[PDB]
Short mmCIF file of C-alpha atoms in Angstrom, two decimals:
data_model
loop_
_atom_site.label_atom_id
_atom_site.label_comp_id
_atom_site.label_asym_id
_atom_site.label_seq_id
_atom_site.Cartn_x
_atom_site.Cartn_y
_atom_site.Cartn_z
CA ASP A 208 132.98 91.52 101.44
CA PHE A 209 129.45 92.89 101.63
CA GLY A 210 128.80 90.70 104.68
CA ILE A 211 130.85 93.10 106.80
CA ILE A 212 127.75 95.36 106.93
CA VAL A 213 125.99 92.76 109.14
CA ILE A 214 128.78 92.66 111.70
CA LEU A 215 129.15 96.47 111.96
CA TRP A 216 125.47 97.09 112.53
CA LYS A 217 125.47 94.34 115.23
CA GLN A 218 128.07 96.51 116.95
CA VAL A 219 125.39 99.21 117.07
CA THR A 220 124.07 97.68 120.26
CA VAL A 221 120.89 99.09 121.71
CA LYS A 222 120.61 97.64 125.18
CA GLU A 223 117.83 98.20 127.68
CA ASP A 224 118.57 101.92 127.97
CA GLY A 225 117.50 102.47 124.34
CA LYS A 226 120.64 104.43 123.40
CA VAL A 227 122.56 104.02 120.13
CA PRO A 228 126.41 103.89 120.19
CA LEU A 229 127.72 106.82 118.10
CA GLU A 230 130.88 105.32 116.66
CA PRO A 231 129.59 101.84 115.97
CA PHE A 232 126.50 103.36 114.32
CA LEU A 233 128.56 105.69 112.08
CA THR A 234 131.12 103.10 110.94
CA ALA A 235 128.20 100.84 110.03
CA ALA A 236 126.32 103.79 108.41
CA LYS A 237 129.22 104.25 106.03
CA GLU A 238 128.94 100.63 104.83
CA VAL A 239 125.30 101.23 103.77
CA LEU A 240 126.75 103.21 100.82
CA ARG A 241 127.42 99.72 99.41
CA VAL A 242 123.71 99.82 98.60
CA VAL A 243 123.70 103.05 96.60
CA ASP A 244 126.83 101.80 94.85
CA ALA A 245 124.99 98.68 93.64
CA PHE A 246 121.99 100.82 92.55
CA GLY A 247 124.21 103.13 90.45
CA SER A 248 124.17 106.89 89.66
CA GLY A 249 120.34 107.19 89.64
CA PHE A 250 120.63 107.01 93.49
CA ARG A 251 122.87 110.09 93.64
CA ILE A 252 120.41 111.94 95.87
CA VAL A 253 120.49 109.08 98.40
CA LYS A 254 124.23 108.47 98.14
CA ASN A 255 125.33 112.13 98.50
CA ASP A 256 122.60 112.71 101.10
CA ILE A 257 123.75 109.91 103.41
CA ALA A 258 127.40 110.86 102.94
CA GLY A 259 126.95 114.51 103.82
CA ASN A 260 125.20 113.15 106.83
CA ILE A 261 127.68 110.64 108.08
CA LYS A 262 130.32 113.46 107.70
CA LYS A 263 128.19 116.20 109.35
CA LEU A 264 127.48 113.94 112.32
CA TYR A 265 131.26 113.49 112.88
CA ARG A 266 131.78 117.26 112.38
CA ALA A 267 128.96 118.19 114.87
CA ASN A 268 130.27 115.75 117.54
CA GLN A 269 133.36 117.30 119.10
CA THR A 270 133.38 119.33 122.24
CA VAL A 271 130.18 117.42 123.07
CA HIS A 272 131.92 114.05 122.64
CA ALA A 273 128.57 112.30 122.99
CA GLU A 274 128.98 108.55 123.25
CA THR A 275 125.54 107.64 121.77
CA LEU A 276 123.20 109.25 119.22
CA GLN A 277 120.69 110.14 121.95
CA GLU A 278 123.13 112.14 124.04
CA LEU A 279 124.37 114.07 121.01
CA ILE A 280 120.92 115.19 120.02
CA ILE A 281 120.10 116.20 123.60
CA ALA A 282 123.18 118.49 123.74
CA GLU A 283 121.94 120.46 120.74
CA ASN A 284 118.37 120.57 122.01
CA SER A 285 117.15 122.20 118.81
CA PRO A 286 115.30 121.02 115.71
CA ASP A 287 117.67 123.18 113.57
CA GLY A 288 120.87 121.92 115.20
CA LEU A 289 123.45 120.71 112.65
CA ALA A 290 123.65 117.17 113.98
CA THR A 291 119.87 116.85 114.67
CA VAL A 292 118.64 117.94 111.18
CA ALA A 293 121.37 115.61 109.83
CA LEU A 294 120.33 112.56 111.80
CA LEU A 295 116.60 113.16 110.93
CA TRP A 296 117.55 112.83 107.23
CA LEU A 297 120.02 109.94 107.72
CA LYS A 298 117.37 107.89 109.62
CA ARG A 299 114.75 108.71 106.88
CA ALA A 300 117.26 107.28 104.41
CA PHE A 301 117.70 104.04 106.18
CA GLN A 302 113.93 103.64 106.67
CA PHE A 303 113.76 104.12 102.82
CA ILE A 304 116.72 101.75 102.16
CA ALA A 305 115.21 99.32 104.66
CA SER A 306 111.67 99.68 103.23
CA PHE A 307 113.31 99.12 99.70
CA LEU A 308 115.65 96.14 100.30
CA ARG A 309 112.80 94.26 102.13
CA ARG A 310 110.38 94.69 99.27
CA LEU A 311 113.17 93.11 97.25
CA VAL A 312 114.12 90.17 99.42
CA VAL A 313 110.69 88.91 100.49
CA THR A 314 108.01 90.02 97.94
CA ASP A 315 108.27 89.16 94.20
CA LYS A 316 107.60 92.68 93.02
CA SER A 317 109.93 94.23 90.48
CA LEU A 318 112.81 96.45 91.61
CA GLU A 319 111.02 99.36 90.10
CA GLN A 320 107.77 99.11 92.12
CA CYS A 321 110.20 98.46 94.90
CA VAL A 322 111.99 101.79 94.72
CA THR A 323 108.55 103.44 94.23
CA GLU A 324 106.70 102.11 97.30
CA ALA A 325 109.87 102.56 99.36
CA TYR A 326 110.25 106.17 98.26
CA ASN A 327 106.51 106.76 98.53
CA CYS A 328 106.43 105.76 102.22
CA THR A 329 109.61 107.59 103.30
CA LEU A 330 111.41 110.42 101.53
CA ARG A 331 108.85 111.41 98.85
CA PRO A 332 106.87 113.74 101.12
CA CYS A 333 110.17 115.26 102.27
CA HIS A 334 111.15 116.31 98.71
CA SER A 335 109.95 119.37 96.84
CA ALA A 336 108.25 118.62 93.57
CA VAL A 337 111.39 119.45 91.61
CA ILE A 338 113.56 117.11 93.67
CA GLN A 339 110.94 114.31 93.42
CA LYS A 340 111.38 114.58 89.65
CA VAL A 341 115.17 114.16 90.03
CA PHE A 342 114.56 110.97 92.04
CA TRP A 343 112.10 109.55 89.52
CA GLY A 344 114.65 110.50 86.83
CA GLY A 345 117.17 108.42 88.79
CA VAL A 346 114.83 105.41 89.10
CA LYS A 347 114.82 105.32 85.32
CA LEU A 348 118.47 104.17 85.69
CA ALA A 349 117.65 101.28 88.05
CA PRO A 350 119.03 97.73 87.65
CA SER A 351 116.65 94.74 87.80
CA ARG A 352 116.43 92.77 91.10
CA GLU A 353 119.09 90.30 89.83
CA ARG A 354 121.66 92.82 88.65
CA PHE A 355 121.13 94.65 91.94
CA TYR A 356 121.90 91.48 93.87
CA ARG A 357 125.02 90.67 91.87
CA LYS A 358 126.56 94.12 92.29
CA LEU A 359 126.43 93.58 96.10
CA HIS A 360 128.20 90.19 96.08
CA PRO A 361 129.15 87.97 93.05
CA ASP A 362 127.00 85.10 94.32
CA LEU A 363 123.28 86.02 94.29
CA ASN A 364 122.33 83.65 97.15
CA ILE A 365 124.91 85.25 99.46
CA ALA A 366 124.12 88.86 98.50
CA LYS A 367 120.45 88.09 99.27
CA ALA A 368 121.32 86.16 102.48
CA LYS A 369 123.53 89.05 103.59
CA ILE A 370 120.99 91.92 102.96
CA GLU A 371 118.58 89.87 105.15
CA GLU A 372 120.99 89.66 108.07
CA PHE A 373 121.79 93.37 107.54
CA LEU A 374 118.12 94.42 107.81
CA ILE A 375 117.84 92.39 111.05
CA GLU A 376 120.77 94.28 112.60
CA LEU A 377 119.87 97.76 111.31
CA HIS A 378 116.46 97.39 112.88
CA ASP A 379 116.64 98.43 116.51
CA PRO A 380 119.20 101.17 116.21
CA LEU A 381 117.29 102.75 113.31
CA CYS A 382 113.86 102.19 115.06
CA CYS A 383 115.29 103.62 118.28
CA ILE A 384 116.14 106.78 116.39
CA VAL A 385 112.77 106.80 114.56
CA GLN A 386 110.82 106.63 117.86
CA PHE A 387 113.28 109.07 119.47
CA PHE A 388 112.96 111.91 116.85
CA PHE A 389 109.15 111.72 117.53
CA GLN A 390 109.73 112.02 121.32
CA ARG A 391 111.57 115.19 120.37
CA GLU A 392 108.81 116.13 117.84
CA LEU A 393 111.27 116.36 114.94
CA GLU A 394 109.59 114.03 112.41
CA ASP A 395 106.46 115.41 110.70
CA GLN A 396 106.56 113.89 107.21
CA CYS A 397 108.42 110.61 106.98
CA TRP A 398 106.54 107.69 108.45
CA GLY A 399 108.45 104.91 106.68
CA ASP A 400 107.63 101.26 106.30
CA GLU A 401 105.13 100.35 108.98
CA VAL A 402 105.81 96.58 108.66
CA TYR A 403 109.59 96.70 108.91
CA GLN A 404 109.18 99.17 111.76
CA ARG A 405 107.06 96.86 113.90
CA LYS A 406 108.84 95.95 117.17
CA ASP A 407 110.14 92.46 116.17
CA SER A 408 113.39 92.53 114.08
CA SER A 409 112.76 89.36 112.02
CA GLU A 410 108.92 89.43 111.80
CA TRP A 411 108.90 91.30 108.51
CA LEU A 412 110.40 88.22 106.79
CA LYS A 413 107.26 86.05 107.11
#
């Protein structure tokens, strides 16, 4: 039931105030692991990374009881806060996953060049040289575009249709966080996928 990812991210409603709901965002964040599960063990860094992040956000949020991501980060007011460093990395991961899945659903480039350009414009600068080698090691274990699609949903056309709707819904909450971490001067390395990150949420398809 991969399509559930579309519905949960839609629940991450960013209205005019530009705030991201904390619980709808985190439930939906957990369903993104469906992506590293279809990629396989070579995505361990991304899988464990996101996971430790979804968990740490819950752990951090407590006495603060922030309702949205914005309020939670404001309460810590510190680049080294547990929740803030965690969301910086979680966002970077979805920019990567977003930058990746797009290069897969619209362009005709291989999955390999896909993981490369995606990584190259997001997390690569954030990884020490030794960790970059672990990631490239993991890309050696990558499926082809078709096996990737079929591990998400038995029917290729649906899996593809459903990643497309997902990317549409992940867009504003993720981009709200991206632009927000800069307002707080917390992002100095990861720029992400400029196209996907352009204001419109369906533009990147054309």
